[PDB]
Structures are given as C-alpha cells and as structure tokens.
Amino acid sequence: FVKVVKNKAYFKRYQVKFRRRREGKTDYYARKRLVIQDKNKYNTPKYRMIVRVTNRDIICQIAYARIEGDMIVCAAYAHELPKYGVKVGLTNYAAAYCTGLLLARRLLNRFGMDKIYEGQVEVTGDEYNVESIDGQPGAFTCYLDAGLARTTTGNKVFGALKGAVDGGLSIPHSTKRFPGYDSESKEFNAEVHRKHILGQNVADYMRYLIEEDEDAYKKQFSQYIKNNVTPDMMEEMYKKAHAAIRENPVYEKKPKKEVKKKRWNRPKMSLAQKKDRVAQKKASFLRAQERA
Amino acid sequence: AKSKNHTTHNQSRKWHRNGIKKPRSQRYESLKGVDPKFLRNMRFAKKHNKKGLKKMQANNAKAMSARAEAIKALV
Amino acid sequence: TNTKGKRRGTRYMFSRPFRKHGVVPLATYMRIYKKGDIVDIKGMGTVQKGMPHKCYHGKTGRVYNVTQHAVGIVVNKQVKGKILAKRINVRIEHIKHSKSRDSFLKRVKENDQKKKEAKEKGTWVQLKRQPAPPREAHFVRTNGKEPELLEPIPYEFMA
Amino acid sequence: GRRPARCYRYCKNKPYPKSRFCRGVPDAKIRIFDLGRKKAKVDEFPLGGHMVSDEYEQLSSEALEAARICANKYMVKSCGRDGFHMRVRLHPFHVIRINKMLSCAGADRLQTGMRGAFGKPQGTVARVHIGQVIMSIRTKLQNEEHVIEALRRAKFKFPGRQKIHISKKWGFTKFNADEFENMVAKKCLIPDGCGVKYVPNHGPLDKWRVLHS
Amino acid sequence: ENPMRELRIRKLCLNICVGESGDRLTRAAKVLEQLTGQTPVFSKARYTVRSFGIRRNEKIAVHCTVRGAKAEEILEKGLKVREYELRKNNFSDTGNFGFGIQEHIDLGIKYDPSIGIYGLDFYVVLGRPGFSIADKKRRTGCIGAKHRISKEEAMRWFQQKHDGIILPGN
RNA sequence: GUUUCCGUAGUGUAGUGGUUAUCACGUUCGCCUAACACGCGAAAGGUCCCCGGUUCGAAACCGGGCGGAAACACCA
RNA sequence: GUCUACGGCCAUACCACCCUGAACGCGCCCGAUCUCGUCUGAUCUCGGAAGCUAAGCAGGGUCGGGCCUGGUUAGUACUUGGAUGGGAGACCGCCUGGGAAUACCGGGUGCUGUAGGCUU
RNA sequence: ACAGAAACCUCCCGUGGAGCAGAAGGGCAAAAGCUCGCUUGAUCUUGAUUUUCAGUACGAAUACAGACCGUGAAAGCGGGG
RNA sequence: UUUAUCCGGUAAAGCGAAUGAUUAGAGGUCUUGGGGCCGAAACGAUCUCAACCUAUUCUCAAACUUUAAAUGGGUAAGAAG
Ligand SMILES: [Mg+2]
Ligand SMILES: [Mg+2]
Ligand SMILES: [Mg+2]
Ligand SMILES: [Mg+2]
Ligand SMILES: [Mg+2]
Ligand SMILES: [Mg+2]
Ligand SMILES: [Mg+2]
Ligand SMILES: [Mg+2]
Ligand SMILES: [Mg+2]
C-alpha cells in the first residue's frame, strides 16, 4: 500500500483550472494581452486574426472580443478552396496563404473596401505592409493570434498572416519568421518565399520522390496523383486561386432544411429510473443468495 | 514620570461638534489630475468650436422654424 | 505602537477568497468605465500593480479619469472629522460597477414612462416610493380545525 | 510547586496553545484520558455515566489526574478490573503562565517591579464550558451505582461545581440507547471495537453487497 | 482481433552511470555513440553526496534514448546476452520493463585496453498508437483506463516476440 | 534572576574563510636493556556538548536548549 | 440532435470508474523532399493520407467520491439595545430587536455567446 | 548493473504538499516555479496622485504624459529587482 | 430611520474541509523496525512495541479556517436630473 493521494481532501481542496485550459486550447494570459482593449477606448473593439491550423483543415477568422463571448466578423476555412480550383494539399503552408487571403477579401468586400488596399497582387514574398489612403476609409487592422503553435520560422500560422497582409489587412507582422529567413545571417532570400508561397516545396518533394522510387509516390501522396495534379502545374493552380479568390471572395452558404430530426444520442436517466435500479438490484441479489 | 500613551476618548465629540461636512461638491470640478493627452486634445476641441458656428446658427434656426412649424401645425 | 506599512492587516482582506487562486477572469478587464460612473473599490492580491489601499478597501466613488489600464476615482475618506473627497489611481482589476445606483435608473425609467403615459388620461399616479405600510385589516380563516395547542415542553437535562 | 488553583481558576485570557509561539512548556501532568478495558465492545458494556461541568472555568492538569485516579480506585472494588472503561475528555492544553515569582534575596535591593511583566510557562489547564463533559465511564447496566459514586468522589478533586448524569446513548456512541438493538439488527450501525460505524444509504452498492450477504 | 493496439516499443533508454566526471565518463559516451549512432547526453548531479565522491552540478552519467527500428535492433542484440530470459519483477506496474547488462563488449563491441568495460542499463518504454496524446502540447490528455499497458500485458508482450521464459521467484 | 565565556582524540589544549582536523601527552607493537627507565622505529582513537534552520555542504553560520565556568545586583 | 472554430461565466464543469460513436469535423495515424526543431522527427515544423474509434473527445452509466443547491441542527449557538434582574463569584435569568455553523437527511450535475458544418 | 533510506535513468500518480535572495505575512503554474537568447525600461523629462499626514517634509509607492530604446511574428510588456 | 447596493472577517462553528496539535479504540507483514515467546532459520505461529497509513472516535488552536453571524463602514435614493 501507500497513502492515498486522492483523498476526500484531494477533491475538497482541488480547485479546477479554468475550462478552455483543461481542454488545453487557449493562452489566456496572452489572450489577456492580445484581446483586452485599452481604456482610452471604452467601447471600440480590438480585432485579432485567429489562425489555428488543425490537422486536415486550416481555419482563419477575424474576431473581436465582447463580454458575452468574442464575436467573429468573418471566417474563411481551407475546405472552401475546392471552389477556387485547389482540390488537395490544403493544410499545407501555401494553402494557408490562400485561406488568409480569402479572409482578407471576404472581410474587405464588407465595409466596402474591395476597391482599395488590395495589397500585393502578383505576389513577391516581401515586405508588403498596407498604407492607409488619406481622404478614404482608413485601413483595417488586427494583431495576429497564433494560439499555441511554437511559432518557429516557416510555420503556417504567421504564413496565413502573409495571406491576409497580401490581401489588404494591416497586421503588424515582421519577416523574421517567413520561410526564407536565414538564421545565420538575418535577411530573406524572398525568392524562397516565392516557392514557399506557391508550393514548390511540395513540387520539389513531388520530384525528389518519383525518380528514386515508385510506390512511395502514391503512398506518400495518392491524392496528389489522383485528381490529375502534377508538379509543373502546381504553381499555376495557386496563381488561379489568388486571382479567383480576389474576383469573388463572398460566401453564399448552402441553404439547409430537411432533417426528420431523430434523437440518437442517449438521454439522461430520470430520478425514479436510477431510484429503482437500486431496489431492482437488491432483490436481484437478495433473491439470488437466499438459496445458494 | 509616566503618563497616557494615546486615547481617542471624548473626540468623537469634537471632530463631530461642528459636524463632519461631507465635502461641498460643485458642478464643474477641476480637470487637473486628468491624463494630459485628454486635455492636450479637448483644448483643440474647445478652441476650434467657433470655427463651425455658421452651420450651428443656421442649423439652429432650421430646427427652430421647423419646431415653430411643429407647434403651429399642432395649433 | 504599530507599523505604518501600506499592507499591514491585509493578510486576510486582499487574500483571494477560495478556489479562485489564479487566472483573473478576463471579463473583469473588458467592461468599460467612463467618467461619472460609480464604482466600488475592492482590492485584490493577484495583481499588485495599481492596488488601492486598505483604508479604502470596500468604498465607492465616482470615476474622474480613464487611463490605459487604470481608473482615476474620487472617494470620500474619513479622517478625524473632516471627510476628504480624494482621488486615487486604481488598476481596473480592483474595481466593479456598483449596482447601488441601479435601483434608481430602473425607478427613473419607470416614472418618466408612467408619467408620459397617464398624461393622455390625466390620472395622478403614485410616483414616489413609500415605506412599508401597516399591514391592513385582513381576515384569517381556520376552516374545520381548532388551532393546535402548544405547551412549553418539560425540561430534561440532555448532555 | 505552584500557586493554589484559585489564581488560575478562571478563564480570563485567550487560549495559549503550546506551539511555536510559546515554548519551554513543562509536559502536562496528566497523560491517560482512558483506562480499564479499552479493549471492550459496544455490545457488552451499556452504561455511559458522565460527569458534567456547570460553570465556565479552568481545570488544572493536576486536578484531572487526581479526578481520574480516585475513580479508578472506587470502580475496581465495585466492578473489578475488567468491568469498566473510564474516559477523561479534557486534555489540558491551553498553557498557564507565571510571572517568575518576583525572585529576590534576603531584604533584597532590585526586582524591577513590573518591567517585562510577561511570565513563563508554568503548567497546563483545560477550558471547560457549562454542560460540557469532563469524565465519562461505561460499565454494565447492572452496575449504575458503582459509576455514580466513582464520579461522585472525583468531584472533590475538582473546583466549582458539576453534576453527575447518566446518558441515553450506547455507552460511548452518540446513538440513543432505546435504539441500538434494532439499528444493529439491520445494520444502520456496525460494530467497531469501542465505537460503531453509522452506515448510510449512500455509497456504492458493492459496499452494501458485503453486508446482508 | 484488435485494431491498432499494437503493443510496440516507444523507446529504449541507455544510461551509463559512473560517479566520476572527466575521463572514465567521457569514454563511456563513446560506447553509446558507437552502439547507437547518436551523440549521447551527459547527465549531471542533482546534488552533492559525500560517501560517493560526487558534487552538485558535477557530471556523472551519460545517457541516450533510441527509437524506431534501431531500438528493436539494440533490444535485440541486448537480450541475447540475457539469452531471451528475464525475471517477474522487471515487468513493471505501468507496462514497462528493464533488463541490465554487466559488460558493454558482449553486444558486438571491440574492447580497447584504455576504454574498459562499463555495462549499461537498458530499459524500454512500451507504448501503443495514441500514447503521444499526453506528451503533445495542444489538446493534451490522459491515456484511457484500458490503452494502458498493464504488467501482465507487458509480460506476454515480451513472451511472444522475444519468446523468453521470464523465470519466477523474485 | 540578568550579562558574558567555553565545550574538539583516553586528558590538557590548538585550528580554518564553509571542502580539509591537530599538537603534546596517553596508549598498542617492535628495539635496544639481564630487567626496568631513557632512546629509536610502527601504529589506533572522536556526530568537533545536545538540537532544529540555512546552505553544495556546518565541527566551524543562525535560532533553541543542556553541562561546566566567570561578572554585576549602586541612593535610601 | 450534434459537432468544430473562437468564446462567456469558471466543478451543476472536477475526479473515479462502467457502457456507445451513424457524418463532418474534431482526433488517433504515415513520413522527413523542404521550413524548422531535437540525443532521439519522443515533443515542435513541415508533406501527407495507407488504417481505426484502441483512447480524447463526444455521447451516455454508478443507492460512486466531489462540487452546487434545499431541508434538519434551530429559532439552537452568538448578539444591538434594555433594567436599582438573580447570583459570594464564575456566571446565569428575563425584556426589545437581530440571528449563524457542523455532523444528519434531501434534489441537481455545467449553462449558453458569435462564425461555420453534418444529420441533405 | 555495480547502486545500498540517498548518485544515474524511465513510467505512473502528483492543486499545489515545491518553488518563488529575507521575517513573516499576503501573491504566484502549458506562471511570478525552472532552462536559455537578447539586452539595458536600473535610461533622459515635465507634471498628477497614494502612503505615512498637519493631510508639512523625507522615504516608499500608484496612475498618466514626452523623449530614446529591449524584447518579442506581434498585443504588449518593460522607467531596477 | 427605511429601500437598493456594495464592503467587511470578529462572536459562534469546524476541524470526518486545508494547517497545526491530540485521545482512543477497530484496521492494516501497508512500511518497516527493535525486543520477545514459540521457532536453526523461515511476512512460519503467536505475541509485543515502533512508526506509517484505511475506515473511525476524544479533545483543541491568538501568531488556523471550509463555513460563518450580531453590532459596524461606503455609495445611492434626480433640475447639477
Ligand atoms: Mg507567447
Ligand atoms: Mg513522427
Ligand atoms: Mg475514441
Ligand atoms: Mg471507444
Ligand atoms: Mg455524490
Ligand atoms: Mg440606567
Ligand atoms: Mg512564460
Ligand atoms: Mg514612456
Ligand atoms: Mg483579524
């Protein structure tokens, strides 16, 4: 034996953490410092661009924070991108661009600004940083939210940012982490961001793998074979997207009504139905051993 | 040569005889104490008020003749 | 004679209550304060920057400033007679909206509303509050019982 | 030795527990707040005779000693050595003080009179409220008289005033004597050496499964 | 028929304690280097101990963690020396196990008259798919009730692959 | 009662700043001696008073105590 | 119904164990071409998509611990004022108001905020 | 393994029992605990306030504002601890 | 003095809620021990005492507190709205 750590005392005194902590989802200190708006403002919000790359789909959304629960003004996911001619490889840093770009333009169609602060168009992979035009609606801004991603150089998060910056939001971004920064020198190549934005990471992996061995191709990326996608092509899917996104960002939904509406959870057992099960036993037991 | 080392005895009696005056608070209290970047600003608000009085006067008379017409249209 | 130190006797005031030791719920610094609004001070351990101090732990005052994360606030503090309306610079964390005013406001909104209406009648409505009157003649009734007889019960020594 | 109990009869001061704050406390005179057959059972030993204070006072540790002993002496005789339990229920425990005796030699010259008035530890005492138990005993139902008088003699080692009372509980439990035989025969109450466990319609059903089995 | 409760080796830990520092330690690092093929981490003293000749923040042991197939390839060629047989009380309460060796040469290694013979502790962390749930950063958690490798599942692990006897009696 | 001071090998006594412990004496073993002394070579011996704390660590630095010592206890 | 993303209040939410997951996601997973990070691709980053709900999570279960309410204890303990009340004294009695806490009994077990799915 | 109440390693539990130069006292956890990189916000400058209060000083603190900067993808955070 | 509304940590209580003391039994080779006694010796039998801890129980804390009063302290109860 030992001492039981988890006494009654353990649970009388155990003070829960703080829900979105237990689930393990949220810097809040850091949500604190991100969100809370100074009080030389009282009502005016503080927008943050939220990016968490999931695992299958990248979600990007602008949110502002109210006392009832931060309200989302605009949300652009990766699984929308089939619309814009991108079938696959859509949790991949280059698709976080398109997603973040989408977001910037779905937002900027509202408050009527799709005709101004377009940001960069051809795409370089440099300092683009929006400069608000005088005598117009001043540009939009938000303080990027990474969540819990160890934000090393190359990571998709502050890469989707590049999308929303490229798309005409005025986020404070530095360049120290865009894929291309040399951590033994301190500049860009920038023409590495060329690739890194358009997926010639994936092209040049789709080409180192192929000439060595077959059937690691196909295993490692079947859906890159299926859907009649290739290297060479890749660069010129994405360029149709940062064009196609930008001619129409708006969401149309899909209308929804049908469901029969069956209940195929399980329900809470009512009092009496627990109340008997003990009385139902203890009569199953008693009877059983008033015998043998 | 020892003695008393405080008391707060009759006292209530005193700092109370003449009253305890809950501080007489005027309207229009001083803005000294406020962040300078308020005042720095609200003085540019206060200074450039008269620039924009022509609007103010005409726009008053509009509402005054519209409400001379509202009260007369009631009559 | 005792020590003057700013946080004497606070061992068990500023101490956070139970099972709340930790992350300050964010709401408490994302509600808006603005000059005129009346506010109750209530010191807090967790954050020490911009603390009030015990001689006004649990007072109320109106707000006169608003800085980036603090609220300048005018409170009355009694001092051997002369009360002093005096101003401190307390960080938001240690402050709430007193609901003190908020019975009135709801009473105003009702009286202006009940005066504007019943003006098209001209019937005089009871606007003022009025203290709890003496409870009116009512009857009681037993139906088909006499009432139950109490007797004081005999003492026996329990232990 | 010590001033007569008189001078420390009455609770004036706030409890001084022996702790970090006072130290160098001479060990409490009394040490055994139960004797006899403390190896008894609940079911064979049915008479919670009690001694109860009637006054808000302090009791010295050394009184409790005597109070006990003189009840171990009369019971034994009476019942025999096996035929009771005695429990004292006031382990002395706020610490009592003594200015250090105003010590001086012969005619003397200087004592300093009052400076550093604060004394030292002298001993230990109990707080006792009214209607609060000091000693209790159990025997057989048979042997009531032989409890009565044992506590009766103990009252005389012992200041103020205090009634002897016979309880309504199984010996040393809290459970009202009119009621055990029933409460045991059906197992609301399960035997546990001296005391007894109240077992409620609460815990997991496999806890019950062990009883009525 | 089980889906992917493939009881499988998460890691193999090699420690070589030698309460000395400098040489007699620095050489021991080359043994793990040689055996594994990865630069081992020097451990150090938690705190000073007198009968031992060790001091707080002095280097003592040198240790490695080997994983993937190259764990399999050093567990095998590890037990072999212990001729595929262990004892009952190494199959531990959390479904890990541990078998120590006496002399580093017995594992297909060349002795230099300089670089002597420091055996090593081999231990291995059995896992299962979805044991990294704990160790990750986002959406962390705990590993079920089952999905936890009990002593006795870790036993007939080792008894149906390396087919050892696992002799009883302490 | 209050203010000082010590305690370390079998004994008298050194010692350090926080890594380490001595001297002399005593004693055990040889030698020399006919035999003791003396002389010459070898040797073993304490929680550094008892404590709790700090610290990598304490014999040594705090706090408490226990034993042995010293010094005051002046106007009447 | 339910989930995801972001959330509010922070256990009616925790913990312990038992049961079931249709679709989408959410996950587990597979690998190191690049970015990046390690002793170890064990964690982070990245490129994926060959499997399965093994677990999380979600959904449910326990005369389950806990937490949250109700009751009881109890008009008890304690107390504002009150008396030329008692009592050698400790203390105790009453009058006028206020009025707790445990053991012991009950019931409950997270509510919803915006954005977006699926059950068309 | 040698390794023993203590070296070294690995799994599990671990609301806080550690830790946070010190008296306590308050405060603290994908922190304010621990490890490393980068550094000088311990910098220059007006004012307002709190605390000791006479509501005088000093000391210590709190809020702002102006420079010039570190850090950080950034929000902020930072004018000694 | 009411009615709203904050503030408050004293009396009491509890200590089967944290800390700190502390009695007692049931229980436990938990550990482990140190003695026995029966055993060469054997968690072998039986004792015993240490310590720990599993349900319990006695009694307490000014430098404790889950609870937690009475008495008390701010505001507010509008034309400066
Ligand atoms: Mg961060
Ligand atoms: Mg991997
Ligand atoms: Mg599952
Ligand atoms: Mg399942
Ligand atoms: Mg329950
Ligand atoms: Mg009178
Ligand atoms: Mg940090
Ligand atoms: Mg500045
Ligand atoms: Mg107090």
Q: What is the largest CA-CA distance in chain C?
A: 72
Is A67 in Cβ contact with C67 (below 8 Å)? no
Residue whose Cα is closest to the C1' of G65:
A8
Closest CA to A99 of A120, A115, A83, A121: A83
Task: Among C28, C30, C65, pick the best mutation site for testing chain A contact (most A Cβ within 10 A).
Answer: C30
Question: Quick check: E46 CB within 7 A of strand F?
Answer: no
Distance CA E137, CA E40 (A): 25
Distance CA A149, CA A52 (A): 8
Other beta carbons less than 10 A from residue A14's beta carbon: 11
User: Strand, coil or helix: what is A28?
Assistant: coil
Determined by cryo-EM
Closest CA to E101 of E75, E126, E125: E75
Is C71 in Cβ contact with A39 (below 8 Å)? yes
Sequence-distant (≥ 6) Cβ neighbours of residue E53 within 8 angstroms: E19, E20
| Helix or strand holding residue A102 (H, E) | helix A93-108
Judge whether A132 and A103 are in contact, CB under 8 Å: no
Nearest to C21 among A15, A29, A32 (CB): A15
The position carrying tokens 């004592």 is D111
Task: Among A2, A23, A55, A156, pick the best mutation site for testing chain E contact (most E Cβ within 10 A).
Answer: A23
Judge whether C63 and C89 are in contact, CB under 8 Å: no
- Give the distance, in angstroms, between residue A154 CA and nucleotide G14 C1': 39
Q: A28 CA distance to ligand 2 centroid (A)?
A: 29
What is the DSSP annotation of E41-97? EEEE-SS-BTTTTB-TT-EEEEEEEE-THHHHHHHEEEEETTTT--BGGGS-TTSEE
Chain C residues whose beta carbon lies within 8 Å of the beta carbon of residue B29: 64
Judge whether D46 and D176 are in contact, CB under 8 Å: no
Q: Do chains A and E touch (3 or more CB pairs under 8 A)?
A: yes
Sequence-distant (≥ 6) Cβ neighbours of residue A134 within 8 angstroms: none
Distance CA E34, CA E111 (A): 12
The position carrying tokens 């150089």 is A153
What is the DSSP annotation of chain C? -----TTTT-TTTTS--SS--SPPPGGGGSS---TT-EEEE---SS--TT---GGGTT-EEEE----SSEEEEEEEEE-SS-EEEEEEEEEGGGEEE-SSGGGTTHHHHHHHHHHHTTTSS------S---------------S-PPPPP-PPPP----
- Closest alpha carbon within chain D to A291: D213
Chain A residues whose beta carbon lies within 8 Å of the beta carbon of residue C27: 67
Distance CA A161, CA A177 (A): 11
Distance CA A181, CA D178 (A): 88
* Residue B72 vs residues B65, B67, B69, B75: alpha-carbon distances, Å: 10, 8, 5, 5
Closest CA to E31 of E113, E123, E121, E117: E117
Report residue A85: phi and psi, to 5°: 80, 25
A250-284: b or e for each residue (b if 16 or more CB lie within 10 Å)? eeeeeeeeeeeeeeeeeeeeeeeeeeeeeeeeeee
Distance CA C11, CA C5 (A): 12
Chain A residues whose beta carbon lies within 8 Å of the beta carbon of residue D205: 278, 281-282
Judge whether A188 and A175 are in contact, CB under 8 Å: yes
Parallel/antiparallel/unpaired status of strands C38-41 and C60-63 = antiparallel
Token pair belonging to B6? 């405080």
Q: Which ligand is nearest to the CA of A30?
A: 1
Strand H, nucleotides < 7 Å from a protein CB: these are 1-4, 6-16, 25-32, 48-55, 61-66, 72-78
Distance CA D3, CA D5 (A): 6
- Kindly report the nearest CA distance between residue C159 and chain D, in angstroms: 6
Judge whether E40 and E34 are in contact, CB under 8 Å: no
- Give the distance, in angstroms, between residue A155 CA and nucleotide G55 C1': 28
Burial class (CB in 10 A: 0-12, 13-18, 19+), A123: buried
Sequence-distant (≥ 6) Cβ neighbours of residue A268 within 8 angstroms: none
Distance CA D183, CA A164 (A): 76
Question: Quick check: E49 CB within 7 A of strand F?
Answer: no
Distance CA A245, CA A83 (A): 9
Task: Among B38, B39, B42, pick the best mutation site for testing chain C contact (most C Cβ within 10 A).
Answer: B38
Distance CA A100, CA A121 (A): 14
What is the DSSP annotation of B9-66? -TTHHHHHHS--------SS---TTS-HHHHHHHHHHHHTSSTTHHHHHHHHHHHHHH
Strand segments (E) across chain D:
34-36, 49-53, 57-60, 85-88, 94-98, 120-128, 133-138, 162-166, 189-192, 195-198
Chain E residues whose beta carbon lies within 8 Å of the beta carbon of residue A25: 138-139
Q: E128 CA distance to ligand 2 centroid (A)?
A: 14
DSSP 8-state class, residue E98:
E
DSSP 8-state class, residue A177:
S
Is C30 in Cβ contact with A18 (below 8 Å)? no
Chain A residues whose beta carbon lies within 8 Å of the beta carbon of residue C19: 15-16
Token pair belonging to B37? 């970047």
- Give the distance, in angstroms, between residue E94 CA and nucleotide G37 C1': 30
Parallel/antiparallel/unpaired status of strands D189-192 and D195-198 = antiparallel
The position carrying tokens 């600003």 is B41
Strand F, nucleotides < 7 Å from a protein CB: these are 1, 56-57, 64-65, 73-76
Distance CA D58, CA D97 (A): 13
Q: Which nucleotide is nearest to D93 (CA to C1')?
A: I60
Judge whether A90 and A185 are in contact, CB under 8 Å: no
Judge whether D96 and D5 are in contact, CB under 8 Å: no
Is A281 in Cβ contact with D205 (below 8 Å)? yes
- Kindly report the nearest CA distance between residue A5 and chain D, in angstroms: 20
Resolution of the experimentally solved model in angstroms: 3.8
- Kindly report the nearest CA distance between residue E147 and chain A, in angstroms: 20
Count CB pairs under 8 A between chains C and D.
8
Is C30 in Cβ contact with A35 (below 8 Å)? yes
B15: contact with C, CB 8 A cutoff: yes
CA atoms within 13 A on the CB side of B31: 10
- Closest alpha carbon within chain A to C21: A15
Chain A residues whose beta carbon lies within 8 Å of the beta carbon of residue E139: 23-25
Is A35 in Cβ contact with C23 (below 8 Å)? no
CB-based contacts of A24-29 (< 8 A; 24+ apart in sequence): A24/E138, A24/E139, A24/E140, A24/E141, A25/A147, A25/A148, A25/E138, A25/E139, A26/A147, A26/A148, A27/A147, A27/A148, A28/C23, A28/C26, A29/C23
Partners of residue D120 on adjacent β-strands? D98
Distance CA B12, CA C81 (A): 8
Chain E residues whose beta carbon lies within 8 Å of the beta carbon of residue A148: 137-138
Q: Do chains C and E touch (3 or more CB pairs under 8 A)?
A: no
In which order are the strands placed within the sheet that holds A58-64?
A: A48-53, A58-64, A71-77
Report residue C106: phi and psi, to 5°: -80, -30
What is the DSSP annotation of D12-69? -S---BSSSSS--PPPPS---SEEE-TT--GGG----EEEEE-SSEEEEHHHHHHHHH
Partners of residue E54 on adjacent β-strands? E49
Partners of residue E44 on adjacent β-strands? E59
- Kindly report the nearest CA distance between residue B54 and chain C, in angstroms: 31
Partners of residue D136 on adjacent β-strands? D50, D87
Alpha carbon of residue E104 to chain centroid: 14
